[PDB]
RNA sequence: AGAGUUAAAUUAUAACUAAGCUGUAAAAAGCCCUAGUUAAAAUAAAAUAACCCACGAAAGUGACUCUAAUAAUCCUGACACACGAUAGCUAGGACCCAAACUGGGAUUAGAUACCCCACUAUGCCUAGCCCUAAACCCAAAUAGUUACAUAACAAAACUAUUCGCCAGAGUACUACUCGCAACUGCCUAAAACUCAAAGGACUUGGCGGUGCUUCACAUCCACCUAGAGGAGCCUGUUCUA
RNA sequence: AAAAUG
């Protein structure tokens, strides 16, 4: 249910955290 | 005596932080929950250690002592006369309360009332 | 025949007697069961070990000295070498909550000693050492 | 009962008492109507789920020549009327 | 450590009973906690598990109690029916 | 399947009738096992009255049968205590004097021990625990054990012997061992109890 | 918020005994300067009481003692002021034990994971920062009512004065601005473009390597018998031709 | 304990 929306919410946070890190 | 349940739940009136947090409604069922089974266990393994003894000290022989191997049956019969008789007898009655299909039928007589 | 559990402290003026000893000078059984070894050694009053016997020292193995089987007969072994050095009576005193826990307590009894009393001195910190982390994250 | 607060006298250590005024002036008009049913060639059918004096009501409507039913009560008994009893039935007129 | 031994938590043997004496033994430590608290501090459990498990155990507590008030106050209607037939 | 529920098992033995007034709690069974208007199965060919023929040696011949071929079975027992018999009277005329009070001339009897010396104490069942099997020490049931016993010697006389040997004498070669305890299938029997007696810590995993 | 103290366990350290200790469903690795018992400072944490529900504005607080002490003759109110769990940063001190990371050993086709062992940052004290949480009891503050009245579930439906927010979903706890001891950061916070949906509760099936009771009678195991898969032949398929 | 995909 709304973990779905919590899981886009996490996925977009972690891939932005890994961009961050990389560039 | 049953504990106090005043200012423990998270309500409109509460004013305070909630103490207890049901899983599930605390409303009281008009049934009780089936009776468990009691998870079995090996017999007499201290009676097969003294059998197994006769066995390593005399080199694997039933001629030299002849007690420890008649108990090990022995043991063998009361525990499938045990697995046999008590399988009814301890469904039947439990010596303490009622059967839980008593206590069903006894809770449908009088049932709670969460509405009206 | 008034008999109390309560132990017989050296502060009393009691009359109670096992082959001729006090309570005082009975010897102890220390027995730590653990969840994977349980030890015993026979220490006496004087605190001078008299037998020591574990399911380690007893041929076992990995997972096979875990269970009370192994228990029993270290219990064996032990009472076996205590009877060596003449010993009677002793108090057992059981350190932890394991499997081998009751199993190499009787284990005394089938090795020929006589428990008169039984000492539960598990370590219960209150609120010490923080123990590992919890298994099956 | 919530509803039942005008209808009681007052509360005696606990134990709730009902004022036998309103009692008797309900009782008046109710054996008034049930009289006149009667008169008017009306059924009369005594419900009653209560198993320590059912056999009193059966006896009661016996007598009286009106009908009773004190026993488990059907689903469709008053409303599926034309299955559960017959084809073509008369409704009963006044419920006790 | 600091405390004299042999006081606490000791049973004595009666007539050379030794495996009634560890039941007795064990029931003390039971109806005192002492085997579950063991059983919980093998390993470290987190405040916010302690919480929920304290709280579980609070409502299951409550119920079970309630439900065995409820049980011996319908103690009295287990007689046999005498208006069977009815 | 063709024999209802109601039907009950038969009884042989003659002394069972013939002395009914010696007893009153015997007394009180069968005046109620024909009261009861109880149907009772038909007797099968295979066991009679006869007082030369023993529970265990109709065992042995039914389990010896390949196919349906009775009477070979039969004859094969026939042979067997014959062979025995003249291997021990053979052995008996060679003896001196102190010999013959203890040599035994009697098949049945030295079958029967040769079958308890070869009886196994306890047997081993393959528990599945953690995805492995373990050979978990049971005791078995009288039954069982005699069977293990009977079948142990069927299978070692089928395959470990000559072809120019026949099945009466080689089983009775391994009779008169097994009598002594020193046939092959007490060597089987005391490979079964090593066994369990190595793995007698893995006796946990049971739970009955 | 300061100052002082420690009951149990644990350990550095000595003495007797043993060759094993730890470890899991089972093992291996590790330690044999190991293990049990008798004595033992320093550090960390504070069984039962607690089936108690108190204090504080919130975060938060329940080993003991002492001092200071818990605003408002009591409405709401910020971008202003002061706090703000854990995690993280700097300097000094502490380090029993636990543990990110890491190195070994298990399992797996792979396992840089769950399982076992050792250890570091860290959790500890003082000073200075960082200002984030599912910071949730997802229910704003102040005085009230049980009148009308159940979308569904859940903690029943609502008044009077206010403050802060809410304009489809993804983009997006994003880019660009301002400010901040924060420089892989925090707060505020879009647009281009894509779609006609995105969402909350519920009913019934189906499933569940969720859990609990009764079972399997040729049936799953425990167990019995005779066979297939090995050879030749017959015959039926898939392949080449 | 173990155990992926359609
Ligand atoms: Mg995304
Ligand atoms: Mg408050
Ligand atoms: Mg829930
Ligand atoms: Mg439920
Ligand atoms: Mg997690
Ligand atoms: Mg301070
Ligand atoms: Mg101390
Ligand atoms: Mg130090
Ligand atoms: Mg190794
Ligand atoms: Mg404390
Ligand atoms: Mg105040
Ligand atoms: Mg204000
Ligand atoms: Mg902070
Ligand atoms: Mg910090
Ligand atoms: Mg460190
Ligand atoms: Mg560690
Ligand atoms: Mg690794
Ligand atoms: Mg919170
Ligand atoms: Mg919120
Ligand atoms: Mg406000
Ligand atoms: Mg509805
Ligand atoms: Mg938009
Ligand atoms: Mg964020
Ligand atoms: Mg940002
Ligand atoms: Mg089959
Ligand atoms: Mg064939
Ligand atoms: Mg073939
Ligand atoms: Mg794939």
Same mark, same amino acid.
């Given at each position: 249910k709304n973990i779905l929306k919590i899981r886009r919410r996490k996925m977009n946070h972690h891939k932005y955290r890994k961009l961050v890190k990389r560039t | 005596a049953t504990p106090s349940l005043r200012g423990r739940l998270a309500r409109l009136?509460? #004013? *305070? *932080? #909630?103490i207890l947090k049901p899983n599930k409604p605390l409303i009281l069922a008009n049934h009780v929950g089936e009776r468990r089974r009691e998870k079995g266990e090996a017999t007499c393994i201290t009676e097969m250690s003294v059998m197994m003894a006769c066995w390593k000290q005399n080199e694997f022989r039933d001629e030299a002592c002849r007690k420890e191997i008649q108990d090990f049956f022995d043991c063998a019969s009361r525990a499938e006369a045990a697995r046999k008789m008590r399988s009814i007898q301890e469904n039947l009655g439990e010596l303490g309360s009622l059967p839980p299909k008593k206590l069903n039928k006894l809770l449908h007589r009088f049932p709670n009332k969460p509405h009206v | 025949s008034s008999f109390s559990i309560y132990p017989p402290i050296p502060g009393q003026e009691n009359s109670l007697r096992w082959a001729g000893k006090k309570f005082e000078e009975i010897p102890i059984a220390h027995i730590k069961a653990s969840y994977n070894n349980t030890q015993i050694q026979v220490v006496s009053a004087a605190h001078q070990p008299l037998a020591h016997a574990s399911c380690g020292t007893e041929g076992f193995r990995n997972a096979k000295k875990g269970t009370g089987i192994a228990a029993q007969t270290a219990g064996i072994a032990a009472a076996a070498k205590a009877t060596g050095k003449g010993v009677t009576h002793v108090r057992v005193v059981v350190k932890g909550l394991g499997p081998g826990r009751l199993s190499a307590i009787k284990g005394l009894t089938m090795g020929g000693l006589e428990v008169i009393s039984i000492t539960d001195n598990t370590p219960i910190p209150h609120n010490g050492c923080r123990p590992r982390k919890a298994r099956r994250l | 009962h919530r509803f039942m607060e005008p209808y009681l006298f007052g509360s005696r250590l606990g134990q709730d008492i009902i004022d036998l005024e309103q009692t008797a002036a309900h009782l008046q008009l109710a054996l008034n109507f049930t009289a006149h049913v009667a008169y008017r060639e009306g059924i009369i059918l005594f419900v009653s789920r209560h198993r320590q004096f059912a056999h009193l009501i059966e006896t009661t409507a016996r007598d009286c020549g009106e009908y009773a039913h004190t026993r488990y009560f059907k689903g469709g008994l008053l409303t599926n009327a034309p299955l559960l009893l017959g084809p073509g039935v008369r409704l009963p007129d006044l419920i006790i | 450590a600091n405390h004299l031994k042999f006081i606490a938590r000791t049973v004595m043997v009666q007539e050379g009973n030794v495996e009634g004496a560890y039941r007795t033994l064990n029931r003390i430590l039971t109806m005192d906690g002492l085997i579950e608290d063991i059983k919980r501090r093998r390993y470290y459990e987190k405040p916010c598990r302690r919480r929920q498990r304290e709280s579980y155990e609070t409502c299951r507590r409550i119920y079970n109690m309630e439900m065995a008030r409820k049980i011996n106050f319908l103690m009295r209607k287990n007689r046999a029916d005498p208006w069977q037939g009815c | 399947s063709r024999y209802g529920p109601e039907y009950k098992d038969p009884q042989i033995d003659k002394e069972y009738y013939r002395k009914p007034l010696a007893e009153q709690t015997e007394e009180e069974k069968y005046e109620r096992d024909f009261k009861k208007t109880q149907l009772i199965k038909a007797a099968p060919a295979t066991k009679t009255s006869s007082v030369f023929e023993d529970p265990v040696i109709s065992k042995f011949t039914n389990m010896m049968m390949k196919g349906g071929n009775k009477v070979l079975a039969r004859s094969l027992m026939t042979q067997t205590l014959e062979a025995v018999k003249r291997k021990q009277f053979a052995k008996y005329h060679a003896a001196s004097a102190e010999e013959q009070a203890t040599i035994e001339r009697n098949p049945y009897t030295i079958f029967h021990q040769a079958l308890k010396n070869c009886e196994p104490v306890i047997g081993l069942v393959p528990i599945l625990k953690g995805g492995h099997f373990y050979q978990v020490p049971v005791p078995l049931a009288d039954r069982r054990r005699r069977f293990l016993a009977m079948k142990w010697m069927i299978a070692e006389c089928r395959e470990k012997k000559? %072809? %120019?040997?026949?099945m009466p004498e080689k089983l009775s070669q391994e009779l008169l061992e097994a009598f002594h305890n020193q046939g092959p299938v007490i060597k089987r029997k005391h490979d079964m109890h090593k066994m369990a007696e190595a793995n007698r810590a893995l006796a946990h995993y049971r739970w009955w």
């Open positions: - | 009136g509460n #004013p *305070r *932080r #909630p | - | - | - | 000559h %072809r %120019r040997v026949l």
